[PDB]
Design a protein around this ligand. Structure first.
Ligand SMILES: CS(=O)(=O)c1ccc(-c2cnc(NCc3cccc4c3CCO4)n3cnnc23)cc1
Length: 350
Protein backbone atom coordinates (compact mmCIF):
# COMPACT_ATOMS: atom_id res chain seq x y z
CA UNK A 1 0.00 0.00 0.00
CA UNK A 2 1.06 3.61 -0.86
CA UNK A 3 -0.57 6.88 0.39
CA UNK A 4 -2.09 8.54 -2.72
CA UNK A 5 -4.28 11.30 -1.14
CA UNK A 6 -5.55 13.02 2.03
CA UNK A 7 -8.14 15.69 2.96
CA UNK A 8 -9.77 17.33 6.04
CA UNK A 9 -13.49 18.00 6.73
CA UNK A 10 -14.31 21.74 7.40
CA UNK A 11 -16.07 20.98 10.76
CA UNK A 12 -12.65 20.09 12.43
CA UNK A 13 -14.35 17.47 14.73
CA UNK A 14 -13.29 13.77 15.14
CA UNK A 15 -14.46 11.28 12.50
CA UNK A 16 -15.75 8.15 14.31
CA UNK A 17 -16.87 6.00 11.37
CA UNK A 18 -16.21 5.14 7.71
CA UNK A 19 -17.85 2.57 5.37
CA UNK A 20 -17.41 1.77 1.64
CA UNK A 21 -20.68 0.82 -0.13
CA UNK A 22 -20.10 -2.89 -0.93
CA UNK A 23 -23.45 -3.14 -2.86
CA UNK A 24 -22.31 -1.29 -6.07
CA UNK A 25 -21.70 -3.24 -9.36
CA UNK A 26 -18.25 -3.41 -11.09
CA UNK A 27 -17.88 -0.33 -13.33
CA UNK A 28 -20.28 1.73 -11.15
CA UNK A 29 -19.00 4.56 -8.81
CA UNK A 30 -16.79 3.52 -5.81
CA UNK A 31 -18.37 5.43 -2.88
CA UNK A 32 -17.68 5.66 0.91
CA UNK A 33 -19.48 7.48 3.77
CA UNK A 34 -17.88 9.22 6.82
CA UNK A 35 -19.57 10.19 10.14
CA UNK A 36 -18.42 12.95 12.52
CA UNK A 37 -19.95 15.91 14.47
CA UNK A 38 -23.65 16.14 13.29
CA UNK A 39 -22.75 15.15 9.70
CA UNK A 40 -22.75 12.23 7.21
CA UNK A 41 -20.63 12.82 4.05
CA UNK A 42 -20.38 10.86 0.74
CA UNK A 43 -17.20 10.66 -1.40
CA UNK A 44 -16.31 9.01 -4.71
CA UNK A 45 -12.91 7.31 -5.39
CA UNK A 46 -11.52 8.05 -8.89
CA UNK A 47 -8.27 7.06 -10.69
CA UNK A 48 -4.82 8.60 -9.78
CA UNK A 49 -5.85 8.88 -6.09
CA UNK A 50 -8.62 11.51 -6.71
CA UNK A 51 -11.40 11.79 -4.03
CA UNK A 52 -14.52 13.79 -5.05
CA UNK A 53 -16.99 15.24 -2.50
CA UNK A 54 -20.52 14.14 -3.54
CA UNK A 55 -23.02 15.40 -0.90
CA UNK A 56 -23.58 15.82 2.87
CA UNK A 57 -26.45 15.29 5.39
CA UNK A 58 -26.35 17.90 8.23
CA UNK A 59 -28.64 17.11 11.20
CA UNK A 60 -31.10 19.81 12.44
CA UNK A 61 -29.69 19.35 15.99
CA UNK A 62 -26.23 21.01 16.20
CA UNK A 63 -25.49 18.92 19.39
CA UNK A 64 -26.09 15.49 17.68
CA UNK A 65 -22.91 13.35 17.42
CA UNK A 66 -23.08 10.53 14.83
CA UNK A 67 -21.07 7.46 15.95
CA UNK A 68 -21.90 4.84 13.28
CA UNK A 69 -23.23 4.22 9.74
CA UNK A 70 -24.15 1.14 7.61
CA UNK A 71 -25.21 0.49 3.97
CA UNK A 72 -28.13 -1.61 2.63
CA UNK A 73 -30.28 -1.79 -0.52
CA UNK A 74 -34.04 -1.59 -1.32
CA UNK A 75 -35.21 -5.23 -1.81
CA UNK A 76 -37.49 -4.20 -4.77
CA UNK A 77 -35.28 -1.70 -6.72
CA UNK A 78 -31.68 -2.69 -5.57
CA UNK A 79 -31.03 1.08 -4.98
CA UNK A 80 -28.56 1.82 -2.12
CA UNK A 81 -29.68 3.16 1.30
CA UNK A 82 -27.63 4.47 4.29
CA UNK A 83 -28.46 4.16 8.05
CA UNK A 84 -26.87 6.57 10.61
CA UNK A 85 -27.08 7.00 14.43
CA UNK A 86 -25.35 8.47 17.48
CA UNK A 87 -25.73 10.42 20.76
CA UNK A 88 -29.48 11.24 20.24
CA UNK A 89 -30.33 7.52 20.09
CA UNK A 90 -32.31 8.09 16.83
CA UNK A 91 -31.81 5.88 13.72
CA UNK A 92 -32.07 7.79 10.38
CA UNK A 93 -32.49 6.16 6.94
CA UNK A 94 -30.94 8.39 4.26
CA UNK A 95 -31.46 8.32 0.47
CA UNK A 96 -27.82 8.68 -0.86
CA UNK A 97 -28.91 10.27 -4.23
CA UNK A 98 -30.47 13.38 -2.53
CA UNK A 99 -28.80 12.94 0.96
CA UNK A 100 -32.25 13.48 2.56
CA UNK A 101 -33.76 11.54 5.52
CA UNK A 102 -36.59 9.20 4.30
CA UNK A 103 -37.63 8.01 7.80
CA UNK A 104 -36.41 7.73 11.40
CA UNK A 105 -36.75 5.31 14.46
CA UNK A 106 -37.02 6.38 18.15
CA UNK A 107 -36.90 3.91 21.09
CA UNK A 108 -33.40 3.39 22.60
CA UNK A 109 -33.09 5.09 26.02
CA UNK A 110 -29.57 6.40 25.21
CA UNK A 111 -26.89 6.77 22.44
CA UNK A 112 -26.43 4.17 19.66
CA UNK A 113 -22.82 2.86 19.32
CA UNK A 114 -23.12 0.56 16.24
CA UNK A 115 -25.49 -0.31 13.36
CA UNK A 116 -25.27 -3.57 11.30
CA UNK A 117 -27.45 -4.97 8.50
CA UNK A 118 -28.28 -8.72 8.27
CA UNK A 119 -26.04 -10.44 5.63
CA UNK A 120 -28.94 -12.09 3.75
CA UNK A 121 -31.98 -9.86 4.52
CA UNK A 122 -31.43 -6.15 3.63
CA UNK A 123 -34.47 -5.07 5.72
CA UNK A 124 -33.11 -6.41 9.07
CA UNK A 125 -31.17 -3.74 11.00
CA UNK A 126 -29.34 -4.33 14.33
CA UNK A 127 -28.60 -1.41 16.73
CA UNK A 128 -26.50 -1.52 19.98
CA UNK A 129 -26.91 1.10 22.72
CA UNK A 130 -25.63 2.78 25.92
CA UNK A 131 -29.04 1.70 27.40
CA UNK A 132 -27.50 -1.90 27.81
CA UNK A 133 -29.67 -3.44 25.01
CA UNK A 134 -29.52 -4.54 21.35
CA UNK A 135 -32.60 -3.99 19.09
CA UNK A 136 -33.55 -5.73 15.78
CA UNK A 137 -35.68 -3.62 13.37
CA UNK A 138 -37.56 -4.49 10.13
CA UNK A 139 -37.15 -1.33 8.01
CA UNK A 140 -39.68 -2.54 5.36
CA UNK A 141 -42.66 -2.63 7.81
CA UNK A 142 -41.13 -0.09 10.33
CA UNK A 143 -41.39 -2.59 13.22
CA UNK A 144 -39.28 -3.41 16.29
CA UNK A 145 -38.79 -7.23 15.97
CA UNK A 146 -36.97 -7.87 19.29
CA UNK A 147 -35.12 -6.33 22.25
CA UNK A 148 -32.03 -8.31 23.47
CA UNK A 149 -31.47 -7.45 27.11
CA UNK A 150 -32.74 -7.66 30.64
CA UNK A 151 -32.00 -10.00 33.58
CA UNK A 152 -29.14 -11.90 31.82
CA UNK A 153 -28.32 -9.29 29.18
CA UNK A 154 -25.46 -6.77 29.27
CA UNK A 155 -25.14 -4.89 32.62
CA UNK A 156 -23.39 -1.80 31.13
CA UNK A 157 -23.16 0.16 27.78
CA UNK A 158 -23.03 -2.07 24.63
CA UNK A 159 -20.17 -1.01 22.27
CA UNK A 160 -20.23 -3.43 19.30
CA UNK A 161 -22.00 -6.42 17.64
CA UNK A 162 -21.67 -8.60 14.53
CA UNK A 163 -23.83 -11.16 12.66
CA UNK A 164 -22.16 -14.46 11.59
CA UNK A 165 -21.72 -15.42 7.87
CA UNK A 166 -25.39 -16.47 7.28
CA UNK A 167 -27.04 -14.24 9.93
CA UNK A 168 -28.09 -17.21 12.15
CA UNK A 169 -26.54 -15.61 15.29
CA UNK A 170 -25.12 -12.36 16.76
CA UNK A 171 -22.10 -11.77 19.11
CA UNK A 172 -22.26 -8.51 21.20
CA UNK A 173 -19.77 -6.85 23.61
CA UNK A 174 -19.36 -3.85 25.91
CA UNK A 175 -18.36 -1.98 29.08
CA UNK A 176 -19.24 -4.97 31.37
CA UNK A 177 -16.14 -6.83 29.82
CA UNK A 178 -18.50 -9.54 28.43
CA UNK A 179 -19.09 -11.11 24.99
CA UNK A 180 -22.62 -12.58 24.61
CA UNK A 181 -24.12 -14.86 21.90
CA UNK A 182 -27.76 -14.42 20.71
CA UNK A 183 -29.19 -17.09 18.35
CA UNK A 184 -31.75 -15.68 15.86
CA UNK A 185 -32.46 -19.01 13.98
CA UNK A 186 -34.53 -20.29 17.00
CA UNK A 187 -38.25 -21.14 16.35
CA UNK A 188 -39.21 -18.05 18.48
CA UNK A 189 -37.01 -15.60 16.47
CA UNK A 190 -37.85 -17.05 13.01
CA UNK A 191 -41.61 -16.72 13.82
CA UNK A 192 -41.13 -13.12 15.12
CA UNK A 193 -39.29 -12.08 11.87
CA UNK A 194 -42.09 -13.75 9.80
CA UNK A 195 -44.79 -11.88 11.86
CA UNK A 196 -42.95 -8.51 11.43
CA UNK A 197 -43.39 -8.88 7.62
CA UNK A 198 -47.19 -9.44 8.00
CA UNK A 199 -47.73 -6.33 10.16
CA UNK A 200 -49.36 -3.15 8.79
CA UNK A 201 -50.82 -0.51 11.19
CA UNK A 202 -53.42 0.48 8.54
CA UNK A 203 -55.20 -2.95 8.68
CA UNK A 204 -55.39 -3.31 12.54
CA UNK A 205 -55.93 -0.94 15.51
CA UNK A 206 -53.54 -3.12 17.66
CA UNK A 207 -49.77 -2.44 18.02
CA UNK A 208 -47.02 -4.87 16.90
CA UNK A 209 -45.64 -6.71 19.95
CA UNK A 210 -41.82 -7.15 20.07
CA UNK A 211 -40.05 -10.18 21.59
CA UNK A 212 -38.29 -9.47 24.91
CA UNK A 213 -35.17 -11.74 24.81
CA UNK A 214 -33.86 -11.75 28.45
CA UNK A 215 -31.32 -14.63 28.11
CA UNK A 216 -28.26 -15.02 25.80
CA UNK A 217 -27.17 -18.43 24.39
CA UNK A 218 -23.53 -18.06 25.70
CA UNK A 219 -21.57 -15.53 27.81
CA UNK A 220 -17.90 -14.97 28.79
CA UNK A 221 -15.86 -12.30 30.68
CA UNK A 222 -12.56 -14.33 30.41
CA UNK A 223 -11.02 -12.88 27.15
CA UNK A 224 -10.29 -9.23 28.12
CA UNK A 225 -9.95 -7.27 31.45
CA UNK A 226 -11.37 -3.87 30.21
CA UNK A 227 -14.14 -2.42 27.91
CA UNK A 228 -14.58 -4.71 24.81
CA UNK A 229 -15.11 -2.18 21.97
CA UNK A 230 -15.00 -4.29 18.74
CA UNK A 231 -16.19 -7.84 17.82
CA UNK A 232 -16.24 -9.65 14.43
CA UNK A 233 -16.91 -13.28 13.37
CA UNK A 234 -14.18 -15.16 11.38
CA UNK A 235 -16.12 -18.26 10.29
CA UNK A 236 -17.18 -20.03 13.55
CA UNK A 237 -14.31 -18.22 15.39
CA UNK A 238 -14.39 -14.74 17.06
CA UNK A 239 -11.94 -11.76 16.80
CA UNK A 240 -12.35 -9.19 19.64
CA UNK A 241 -10.37 -6.32 21.17
CA UNK A 242 -10.23 -4.12 24.29
CA UNK A 243 -7.78 -1.19 25.05
CA UNK A 244 -4.98 -3.74 25.98
CA UNK A 245 -2.89 -3.59 22.73
CA UNK A 246 -4.18 -6.93 21.29
CA UNK A 247 -6.91 -8.47 19.08
CA UNK A 248 -7.69 -11.97 20.47
CA UNK A 249 -8.87 -14.92 18.29
CA UNK A 250 -11.02 -17.30 20.41
CA UNK A 251 -13.99 -19.72 20.41
CA UNK A 252 -16.70 -20.74 22.98
CA UNK A 253 -16.13 -24.11 24.69
CA UNK A 254 -13.22 -26.57 24.33
CA UNK A 255 -11.04 -27.02 21.16
CA UNK A 256 -13.26 -29.73 19.56
CA UNK A 257 -16.66 -28.18 20.59
CA UNK A 258 -18.93 -27.26 17.64
CA UNK A 259 -20.46 -23.72 17.89
CA UNK A 260 -24.02 -25.06 17.32
CA UNK A 261 -23.64 -27.69 20.14
CA UNK A 262 -22.63 -24.95 22.73
CA UNK A 263 -25.17 -24.77 25.64
CA UNK A 264 -25.99 -21.45 27.49
CA UNK A 265 -24.30 -22.88 30.66
CA UNK A 266 -20.89 -23.37 28.82
CA UNK A 267 -18.12 -22.27 31.26
CA UNK A 268 -15.04 -22.69 28.97
CA UNK A 269 -13.37 -20.69 26.15
CA UNK A 270 -10.34 -21.61 23.94
CA UNK A 271 -7.70 -18.97 22.96
CA UNK A 272 -6.46 -19.63 19.40
CA UNK A 273 -4.20 -16.65 18.65
CA UNK A 274 -3.32 -13.01 19.32
CA UNK A 275 -2.49 -9.99 17.08
CA UNK A 276 -0.07 -7.76 19.10
CA UNK A 277 0.55 -4.03 18.49
CA UNK A 278 1.50 -0.74 20.24
CA UNK A 279 -0.01 2.64 21.26
CA UNK A 280 -3.71 1.69 20.89
CA UNK A 281 -4.74 1.70 24.61
CA UNK A 282 -7.56 4.32 24.51
CA UNK A 283 -11.33 3.46 24.41
CA UNK A 284 -13.29 3.56 21.05
CA UNK A 285 -10.88 2.21 18.36
CA UNK A 286 -12.30 -0.16 15.68
CA UNK A 287 -10.63 -2.89 13.57
CA UNK A 288 -12.00 -4.02 10.18
CA UNK A 289 -11.72 -6.84 7.65
CA UNK A 290 -12.06 -6.77 3.85
CA UNK A 291 -15.11 -8.36 2.07
CA UNK A 292 -13.41 -11.77 1.57
CA UNK A 293 -11.97 -11.75 5.14
CA UNK A 294 -8.32 -12.16 3.85
CA UNK A 295 -7.01 -8.84 5.37
CA UNK A 296 -7.31 -7.22 8.85
CA UNK A 297 -6.68 -3.51 9.60
CA UNK A 298 -6.47 -1.34 12.77
CA UNK A 299 -5.33 2.24 13.35
CA UNK A 300 -3.49 3.43 16.48
CA UNK A 301 -3.71 6.62 18.66
CA UNK A 302 -0.67 8.32 16.94
CA UNK A 303 -1.72 7.83 13.27
CA UNK A 304 -0.05 4.50 12.41
CA UNK A 305 -2.04 1.89 10.41
CA UNK A 306 -1.46 -1.85 11.03
CA UNK A 307 -2.39 -4.40 8.28
CA UNK A 308 -2.28 -8.23 8.65
CA UNK A 309 -2.59 -10.87 5.89
CA UNK A 310 -5.00 -13.52 7.30
CA UNK A 311 -4.19 -16.00 4.43
CA UNK A 312 2.19 -7.18 9.94
CA UNK A 313 2.73 -4.09 7.74
CA UNK A 314 2.88 -0.59 9.34
CA UNK A 315 1.64 2.27 7.11
CA UNK A 316 2.85 5.77 8.14
CA UNK A 317 2.79 9.34 6.73
CA UNK A 318 4.71 12.31 8.29
CA UNK A 319 1.47 14.44 8.25
CA UNK A 320 -0.78 11.67 9.82
CA UNK A 321 -0.40 11.98 13.64
CA UNK A 322 -3.96 11.87 15.10
CA UNK A 323 -5.85 8.77 16.41
CA UNK A 324 -7.30 6.57 13.57
CA UNK A 325 -10.82 5.65 14.86
CA UNK A 326 -11.94 3.37 11.96
CA UNK A 327 -10.82 2.07 8.53
CA UNK A 328 -12.64 0.62 5.47
CA UNK A 329 -11.49 -1.47 2.48
CA UNK A 330 -13.11 -1.11 -0.99
CA UNK A 331 -14.93 -4.30 -2.10
CA UNK A 332 -11.97 -5.43 -4.32
CA UNK A 333 -9.46 -4.66 -1.43
CA UNK A 334 -7.44 -2.30 -3.76
CA UNK A 335 -8.24 0.81 -1.60
CA UNK A 336 -7.99 1.32 2.22
CA UNK A 337 -9.48 4.53 3.79
CA UNK A 338 -8.56 5.69 7.37
CA UNK A 339 -10.43 8.46 9.35
CA UNK A 340 -8.97 10.51 12.30
CA UNK A 341 -9.63 12.66 15.43
CA UNK A 342 -8.41 15.81 13.55
CA UNK A 343 -11.17 15.36 10.84
CA UNK A 344 -8.64 14.03 8.28
CA UNK A 345 -9.23 11.22 5.69
CA UNK A 346 -6.30 9.11 4.32
CA UNK A 347 -6.33 7.03 1.06
CA UNK A 348 -3.96 4.03 0.67
CA UNK A 349 -3.85 2.19 -2.72
CA UNK A 350 -2.47 -1.35 -3.33
C1 LIG B 1 -12.16 13.24 21.15
S1 LIG B 1 -12.82 12.72 22.69
O1 LIG B 1 -13.60 13.80 23.24
O2 LIG B 1 -11.75 12.19 23.48
C2 LIG B 1 -13.92 11.40 22.27
C3 LIG B 1 -13.39 10.19 21.87
C4 LIG B 1 -14.24 9.16 21.50
C5 LIG B 1 -15.62 9.34 21.50
C6 LIG B 1 -16.53 8.26 21.04
C7 LIG B 1 -16.28 7.54 19.89
N1 LIG B 1 -17.22 6.59 19.43
C8 LIG B 1 -18.16 6.33 20.29
N2 LIG B 1 -19.22 5.52 19.96
C9 LIG B 1 -19.32 4.66 18.79
C10 LIG B 1 -17.98 4.18 18.34
C11 LIG B 1 -17.24 4.91 17.41
C12 LIG B 1 -15.93 4.56 17.09
C13 LIG B 1 -15.36 3.43 17.65
C14 LIG B 1 -16.11 2.70 18.54
C15 LIG B 1 -17.40 3.06 18.91
C16 LIG B 1 -17.98 2.12 19.92
C17 LIG B 1 -16.88 1.10 20.03
O3 LIG B 1 -15.76 1.54 19.20
N3 LIG B 1 -18.37 6.99 21.07
C18 LIG B 1 -19.44 6.81 21.87
N4 LIG B 1 -19.39 7.61 22.90
N5 LIG B 1 -18.20 8.36 22.79
C19 LIG B 1 -17.58 7.94 21.68
C20 LIG B 1 -16.14 10.58 21.92
C21 LIG B 1 -15.29 11.61 22.29
Amino acid sequence: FKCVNSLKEDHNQPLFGVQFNWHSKEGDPLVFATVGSNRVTLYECHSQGEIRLLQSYVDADADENFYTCAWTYDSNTSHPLLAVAGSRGIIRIINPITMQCIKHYVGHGNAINELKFHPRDPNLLLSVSKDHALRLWNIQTDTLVAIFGGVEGHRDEVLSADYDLLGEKIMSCGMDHSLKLWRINSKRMMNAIKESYDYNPNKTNRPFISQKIHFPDFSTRDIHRNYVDCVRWLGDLILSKSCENAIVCWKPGKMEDDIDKIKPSESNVTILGRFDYSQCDIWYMRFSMDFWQKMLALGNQVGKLYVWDLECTTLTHHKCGAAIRQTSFSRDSSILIAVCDDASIWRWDR
